[PDB]
Structure 1
Amino acid sequence: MDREEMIARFAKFLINRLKDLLTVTPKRSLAIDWAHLNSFDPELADELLNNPEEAIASAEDAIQIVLREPPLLVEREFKVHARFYNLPKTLLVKELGSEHINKLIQVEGIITRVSEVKPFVEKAVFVCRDCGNEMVRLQRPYENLVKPAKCDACGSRNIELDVDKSRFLNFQSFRLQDRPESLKGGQMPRFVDAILLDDLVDAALPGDRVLVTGVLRVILEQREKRPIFKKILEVNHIEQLSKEIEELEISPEDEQKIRELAKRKDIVDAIVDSIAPAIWGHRIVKKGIALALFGGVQRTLPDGTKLRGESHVLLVGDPGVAKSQLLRYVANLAPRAIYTSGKSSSAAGLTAAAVRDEFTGSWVLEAGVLVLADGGFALIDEFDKMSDRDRSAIHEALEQQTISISKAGITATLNSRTTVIAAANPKFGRFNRHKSLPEQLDLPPTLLSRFDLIFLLLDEPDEKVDASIAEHILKVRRGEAEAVTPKIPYDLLKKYIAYARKNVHPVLSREAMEEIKRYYVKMRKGLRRGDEDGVQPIPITARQLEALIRLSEAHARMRLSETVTREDARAAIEIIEAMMKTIAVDEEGNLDVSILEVGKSSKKINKIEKLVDIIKSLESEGEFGAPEEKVIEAAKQAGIGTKADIEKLLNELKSDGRVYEPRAGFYRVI
């Protein structure tokens, strides 16, 4: 096109848009709209989309020509965001193609990587000392070593660059991935690297959905070579509207949802619809996962006081063929969920970490499944299978609601707010009721106590009662209503979760608070006793009392925001009592097995075994001090344990690091 044709057309339309930009000279941008430009000239809006390389540069010079006029000669606002915020079409990372190259497009998604703000060398001048040839060579972000081999005057080889004569602008590398909210089942998300420039860098960190708009460029392809797969999206306009494109949605079925919520058994109808009817055998176990799909009330208070209302359900010690893995695919009906295993097949893992990039040599900060799924859920198929570096940040991601990544040196501290409904397979082939939850899992005991609900499913061993009910509800279920009988659809139940989590906010009453306070105090005295030379196990800890209100706030979200929550507080404490009937019930409701790897009686018997060991740890009666044959007779006479019980505790002290053994028949305290 012509030079002055697009300059005169842009100066006529845009003025009031440059008057507000003249007040803030450091911004150097303008919030242009596609509907505002098309109302004046429809050909001007279509010309910028088809060719945004030089038409937007002449439009930026048109704003400079309005600033360099005779009436208005203010030498401010040289650069301007010529890319409009409003767009006629918003492309995605999954629908991206090669037909939109060298054009203006809007990409929506989430950010995963973010590089450090470094200076970009643009319009690099080169002046020699022996020849003195004045020449400038333009350098791009993807270009490398853009310099001449010799001078054009005398062919000098000692060419020096001028950093003062050249232009230095801000540069930042970011990776835009697909959003997990709009991504359905059976979809592979693709990643596309972008570049942030001056007046647009440090716009958003990793772990949040951000909108991107600008010119989509590509790497230079040489002749007789392979096609370059490197594609860089030069984002120009800084705007945050991807959250309103995905999360903000009109729900016309909310008027029909008032008729369904006014009837009875509405909580039991949603539990039977959000789970597959083919998987049967557990009602209260599936009710805890169904109540965990709706969050609680997260309000701010002074002095940094906050309380999370996300109940994390974790199952350990499950069988080989368990229905919880098939229910994990049905657990993705909640919004902003990501169905990925614990082994994320990346250097970042589940939490955020710093990974080296091959396209940009600068250090970037990646984001895992716990950061990109903030505000929703994050289902993990293998909670036990995790890296050691990811396990060091999982203790703060589920507790302090932040990943707290500080190994990169920038201390980004990405937020980790995801209601994780995970599951973990046992290390052994079968599960037993004698072993605790921390002994039958690879994870530490600090992550098991943080979970609000812990369930363990197991079938009957005898085939007279197990096989007569297992295959009876599965053989006739083929091509019938026994496999699937949802009263409401899965997409219809997912639409009701968005109206209850964002708009509905229930609160319990004083009578409902008295039900949770009296039940926690009555069970505290039913299991209270006196421990000899030790501390008695508490029935319910104070940290577990905060999870009892989280189960009550989740059931009150489906109770149409009732003030008197006494009807839902009884089932919330009964669901926690069913989990406490088997888990953390070692001695008598002993919660020490949930907060620590060793229980109350497991540590008291080890302390009684320490009395028989430290009394002769220095006296070498056998091969070393405190011989194992002498300590077994001292423990059996005192009532600590038998010969098979002390042998299971001798190897447990060597694994935990309390008592080792130099030779066979002698165990010395470490």
Structure 2
Amino acid sequence: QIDYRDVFIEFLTTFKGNNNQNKYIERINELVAYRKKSLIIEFSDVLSFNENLAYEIINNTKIILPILEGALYDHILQLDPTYQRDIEKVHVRIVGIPRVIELRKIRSTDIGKLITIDGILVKVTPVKERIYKATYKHIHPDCMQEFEWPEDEEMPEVLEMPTICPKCGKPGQFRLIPEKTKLIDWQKAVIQERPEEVPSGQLPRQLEIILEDDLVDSARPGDRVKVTGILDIKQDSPVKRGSRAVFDIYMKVSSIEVSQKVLQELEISPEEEQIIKELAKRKDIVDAIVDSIAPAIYGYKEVKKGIALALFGGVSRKLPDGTRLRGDIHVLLVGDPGVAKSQILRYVANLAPRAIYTSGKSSSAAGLTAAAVRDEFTGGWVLEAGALVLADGGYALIDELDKMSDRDRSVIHEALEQQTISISKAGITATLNARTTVIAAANPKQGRFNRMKNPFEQIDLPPTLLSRFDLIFVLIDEPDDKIDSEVARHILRVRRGESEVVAPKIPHEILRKYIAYARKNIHPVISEEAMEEIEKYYVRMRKSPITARQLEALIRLSEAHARMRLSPIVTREDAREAIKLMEYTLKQIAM
């Protein structure tokens, strides 16, 4: 950490304008005299005064700005303590700040200007050296003198020689002198689009960037970075023809920092915020939701409640004392073929605000996780995001998880538990966030597993994976004349076109907004009561087989129930509900 508060104040009080006037001393004065609450700062001014500050404003905008406003405020109360009786705070507005362009939208209108790109590094060359001023010796018996070539002019990226010795005037052989030539650190790197911004199966576009001097080695392959610089056009075969008058685009980096991915939340309407605030009050809230989850289905009151809790999720707090505590809850539905599994998933996607519906079988290399791929056209490797990476921060409804890739099975455990996926290929080592909630459907290898034989050996999924699902609903279909009829009826109605009173009790769009608010602003805290009940339940159920991992889920489900409750506090009623669901699942395994 460094103090940008003094450079900022120093910049305001000493920067010089077109007429050697203190541009900002005067602007701060008017602001005072007219009781204004914003100071308009030009980016180029700061950039020219102190590059470090300029870039801190670009790379750490959200943290640095509030500090600068505070420093400006204190500075103002110093000029006039009275300002405070009229204004509580000041706003600094930086105009002229480099546009943020998505890598794949770079056009000719951007060449020559200062912009900023977001991406991931996939290649770095070793540090080399560039000549920005040479010294040649005119090997000639009458001459043999030396001189700095590009006179009053930096050498070109292409290397140019002196046709006519400027010391002797006569041509000849020029033998570059290294000892007296000046050098600058150079490094070529390649950055690709952020995996999340690329359509499944598609190759992520790439861009060449040049780091020089102090920027050399600011990052390593596999790093997510924010690069700011000027784009220009180049050619591998310079100043000559070749195939045309077509040029490649590359950036001359000015600043580069490793960054963190920023999920973009959904717009909250204070109108909606209260609307939701209203439903929360409602008493049959918990049940409407479950009943709104997937109407085009008869019953499954419990199964629907599972999905419901999954959508809201648990605490999800990662802290020092005990590192990461995952709040996302995963739900798996194993069942007899034709029991609506593959169906129910698809239905939730239609409710999906931030989801991805996909199956255990993929046609893309990434699949359900991620992977490094080779790009024939560029010859370099790149990272492609599978479903869990694309679904980060959201939901990933996985169907036929039974038929999942070999590559997927390997890294699958990491994504569900660690909530990340690490990739190592070529010189690339990157860790992508897979903070996503999972709801998958699975079938037993041969078909109905209803046979007294255990349910889990019948499914093509290692018991290691199973232990990772907070709730697993073993499903079987036994005909109960009435129920079959019920299902039939339901199906016949759905098949017959429109006119179907199969609408969610609660409103979908309004529910989406419901959940989001629910995951962003509400963070349930464990209750004393819950703690007691669950604890007793745990010993009880174990006295019955169970694992501490189940306990892990228990707490998560409780938190979830409470999040729909938005208390935000857990309550015995909560826990109870949580354990209730959990037991129903266990008696289910008994088939």
Q: Normalised by the shorter chain, which TM-score bucket?
A: 0.5 to 0.7
The answer to whether the aligner puts 1:272 opposite 2:291 as a matched pair is: yes
Distance 1:93 1:291, change over 3 A: farther
Distance 1:506 1:196, change over 3 A: farther
The answer to whether the aligner puts 1:173 opposite 2:187 as a matched pair is: no
> Could you say which residue in structure 1 is the equivalent of 2:421?
403
Match of 1:192 among 197, 202, 205: 205
Match of 2:565 among 559, 568, 572: 559
Alpha-carbon distance, 1:487 to partner? 4.0
CA distance in 1, matches of 2:136, 2:298: 81
Distance 1:358 1:479, change over 3 A: closer
The answer to whether the aligner puts 1:102 opposite 2:120 as a matched pair is: no
Alpha-carbon distance, 1:445 to partner? 1.5
Alpha-carbon distance, 1:413 to partner? 4.3
The answer to whether the aligner puts 1:119 opposite 2:127 as a matched pair is: yes
The answer to whether the aligner puts 1:469 opposite 2:447 as a matched pair is: no
> Could you say which residue in structure 2 is the equivalent of 1:293?
311
One-letter amino acid of the structure 1 residue matched with residue 127 of structure 2? P
One-letter amino acid of the structure 2 residue matched with residue 256 of structure 1? I
The answer to whether the aligner puts 1:494 opposite 2:512 as a matched pair is: yes
Matches within 5 A, 1:69-218: 84-85=96-97, 87=99, 96=105, 100=109, 102=111, 111=119, 114-116=122-124, 118-119=126-127, 138-139=156-157, 165-177=182-194, 179=196, 191-198=204-211, 199=215
CA distance in 2, matches of 1:386, 1:157: 65
Distance 1:328 1:169, change over 3 A: farther
CA distance in 2, matches of 1:232, 1:203: 18
> Percent identity between the aligned chains?
52
CA distance in 1, matches of 2:180, 2:562: 64
Q: CA contact under 8 A between 1:177 and 1:190: conserved in structure 2? A: no
Alpha-carbon distance, 1:384 to partner? 3.0
Q: C-alpha deviations, 1:42-88, integer Å up to 9, x for none?
A: xxxxxxxxxxxxxxxxxxxxxxxxxxxxxxxxxxxxxxxx995364x
Distance 1:411 1:287, change over 3 A: same
Alpha-carbon distance, 1:557 to partner? 0.3
Alpha-carbon distance, 1:379 to partner? 3.1
Distance 1:157 1:23, change over 3 A: closer
CA distance in 1, matches of 2:325, 2:402: 26
- 1:378 aligned counterpart, secondary structure: strand
Q: C-alpha deviations, 1:606-660, integer Å up to 9, x for none?
A: xxxxxxxxxxxxxxxxxxxxxxxxxxxxxxxxxxxxxxxxxxxxxxxxxxxxxxx
> Could you say which residue in structure 2 is the equivalent of 1:257?
276
Q: CA contact under 8 A between 2:231 and 2:251: conserved in structure 1? A: yes
> Could you say which residue in structure 2 is the equivalent of 1:520?
538
> Could you say which residue in structure 2 is the equivalent of 1:56?
none
Alpha-carbon distance, 1:327 to partner? 2.6
CA distance in 2, matches of 1:344, 1:14: 61
Match of 1:246 among 264, 268, 292: 264
CA distance in 1, matches of 2:116, 2:358: 24
Q: C-alpha deviations, 1:259-278, integer Å up to 9, x for none?
A: 111011112222333x3422
Which of structures 1 and 2 has the larger relative contact order (alpha carbons within 8 angstroms, sep 6+)? 2
CA distance in 2, matches of 1:359, 1:479: 49
CA distance in 2, matches of 1:99, 1:277: 52
Q: CA contact under 8 A between 1:117 and 1:201: conserved in structure 2? A: no
Distance 1:285 1:177, change over 3 A: same
One-letter amino acid of the structure 1 residue matched with residue 579 of structure 2? I
The answer to whether the aligner puts 1:386 opposite 2:404 as a matched pair is: yes
One-letter amino acid of the structure 2 residue matched with residue 271 of structure 1? V
Q: TM-score, structure 1 length as denominator? A: 0.60
Distance 1:509 1:229, change over 3 A: farther
Q: CA contact under 8 A between 1:193 and 1:232: conserved in structure 2? A: no
Q: CA contact under 8 A between 1:507 and 1:565: conserved in structure 2? A: no
CA distance in 1, matches of 2:336, 2:209: 47
Alpha-carbon distance, 1:231 to partner? 6.2
More strand by share: 2
CA distance in 2, matches of 1:83, 1:117: 35
Matches within 5 A, 1:264-343: 264-273=283-292, 275-319=293-337, 322-325=340-343, 327-328=345-346, 330-331=348-349, 333=351, 336-343=354-361
One-letter amino acid of the structure 2 residue matched with residue 102 of structure 1? I
> Could you say which residue in structure 1 is the equivalent of 2:80?
none
Alpha-carbon distance, 1:559 to partner? 0.8
CA distance in 2, matches of 1:364, 1:12: 51
One-letter amino acid of the structure 2 residue matched with residue 474 of structure 1? I
One-letter amino acid of the structure 2 residue matched with residue 546 of structure 1? E
Alpha-carbon distance, 1:254 to partner? 1.0
CA distance in 2, matches of 1:264, 1:376: 28
The answer to whether the aligner puts 1:508 opposite 2:526 as a matched pair is: yes
Q: TM-score, structure 2 length as denominator? A: 0.67
CA distance in 1, matches of 2:291, 2:469: 24
CA distance in 2, matches of 1:231, 1:563: 55
Runs of 5+ consecutive residues of structure 1 not aligned to the other structure = 1-7, 34-81, 140-145, 528-537, 587-670
Q: CA contact under 8 A between 1:102 and 1:217: conserved in structure 2? A: yes
- 2:413 aligned counterpart, secondary structure: helix
CA distance in 1, matches of 2:425, 2:261: 29
Q: C-alpha deviations, 1:372-397, integer Å up to 9, x for none?
A: 54333333334233333332222233
Q: CA contact under 8 A between 1:460 and 1:466: conserved in structure 2? A: no
Q: C-alpha deviations, 1:331-354, integer Å up to 9, x for none?
A: 374554343444554445444544
- 1:471 aligned counterpart, secondary structure: helix
Distance 1:257 1:22, change over 3 A: same
Q: CA contact under 8 A between 1:276 and 1:327: conserved in structure 2? A: no
One-letter amino acid of the structure 2 residue matched with residue 542 of structure 1? A
> Could you say which residue in structure 2 is the equivalent of 1:661?
none
Matches within 5 A, 1:54-65: none
Alpha-carbon distance, 1:442 to partner? 3.0
Alpha-carbon distance, 1:366 to partner? 5.4
Q: CA contact under 8 A between 1:318 and 1:425: conserved in structure 2? A: yes
CA distance in 2, matches of 1:365, 1:305: 27
Q: C-alpha deviations, 1:357-378, integer Å up to 9, x for none?
A: 5566666665544345433333
Alpha-carbon distance, 1:554 to partner? 0.7
One-letter amino acid of the structure 1 residue matched with residue 587 of structure 2? K
Alpha-carbon distance, 1:569 to partner? 1.6
The answer to whether the aligner puts 1:374 opposite 2:400 as a matched pair is: no
Runs of 5+ consecutive residues of structure 2 not aligned to the other structure = 1-16, 25-40, 60-93, 141-145, 165-170
Alpha-carbon distance, 1:515 to partner? 1.8
CA distance in 1, matches of 2:172, 2:482: 93
CA distance in 2, matches of 1:403, 1:10: 56
- 1:309 aligned counterpart, secondary structure: coil
> Could you say which residue in structure 1 is the equivalent of 2:578?
572
Distance 1:213 1:280, change over 3 A: farther
One-letter amino acid of the structure 2 residue matched with residue 115 of structure 1? K
